[PDB]
Design a protein around this ligand. Structure first.
Ligand code: ARG
Length: 224
């Protein structure tokens, strides 16, 4: 009577902790999608918050039934788990301080770049010549690093950077063509061979899109 979802709730507006009024709720676009799935199945949704890097291992081990975490369905990951249809696009960007000497992609050479372990953002940064990778479990620490001068830049998705920059007013996004040369988009992951759940997930994503509910969710999370 339960479906267990794994996520990494450091990724507003997809999943994050909204802490106010005596509540600590994990909320976001991905959570709304998860609740639509739970409702179709007629079960209770339980969410486990963990480091992003642990999500695929948890799914493989059966510690969660599905992962929704702004997760890109890469060819590499498809060897290990199964992915739903895409439910949102995404783009890699670079975040720097307002007074950064970095203006363009070439300027990233030899720099210290904060990235989240196990991500396409990390994959993108690894291609920078002579990069000094600073690898973090959680995105929130990457922003603390940049604020405190412990890195020169962050690589992270555009929509998430925009969310963090609501608070981090001394940072800016650089839209560099070349940093986005990785697989894009987000999809739901389920364990390899779990067709029953995958089919339901794909049906729910399709019905969200076709019923108008998806557009309501997108307005709520991405059009503010
Ligand atoms: N909840 C998160 N921290 N998500 C990170 C996702 C980053 C990137 N889209 C990936 O699939 O690797």
């Amino acid at each position: 009577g339960v479906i267990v979802m794994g996520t990494s709730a450091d990724f507003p507006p997809f999943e994050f902790h909204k802490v106010e009024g005596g509540k600590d709720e994990i909320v976001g676009f991905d959570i709304d999608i998860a609740n639509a799935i739970a409702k179709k199945l007629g079960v209770k949704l339980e969410i486990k918050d963990m480091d992003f890097k642990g999500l695929i291992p948890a799914l493989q081990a059966g510690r969660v039934d599905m992962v929704i975490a702004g997760m890109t369905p890469t060819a590499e990951r498809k060897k290990s788990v199964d992915f739903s249809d895409l439910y949102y696009d995404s783009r890699q960007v670079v975040v720097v301080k307002n007074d950064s000497p970095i203006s363009k992609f070439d300027d990233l050479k030899v720099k210290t770049i904060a990235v989240q372990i196990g991500t396409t953002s990390e994959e993108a940064a690894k291609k920078i010549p002579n990069v000094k990778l600073k690898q973090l479990n959680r995105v929130s620490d990457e922003f603390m690093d940049l604020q405190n001068g412990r890195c020169d830049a962050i690589v992270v998705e555009d929509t998430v950077a925009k969310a963090y920059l609501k608070e981090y007013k001394d940072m800016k996004i650089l839209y560099m063509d070349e940093i986005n040369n990785v697989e894009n988009g987000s999809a739901v992951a389920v364990a390899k061979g779990n067709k029953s759940l995958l089919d339901v997930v794909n049906e729910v994503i399709k019905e969200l899109k076709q019923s108008g509910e998806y557009d309501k969710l997108v307005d709520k999370w991405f059009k503010q």
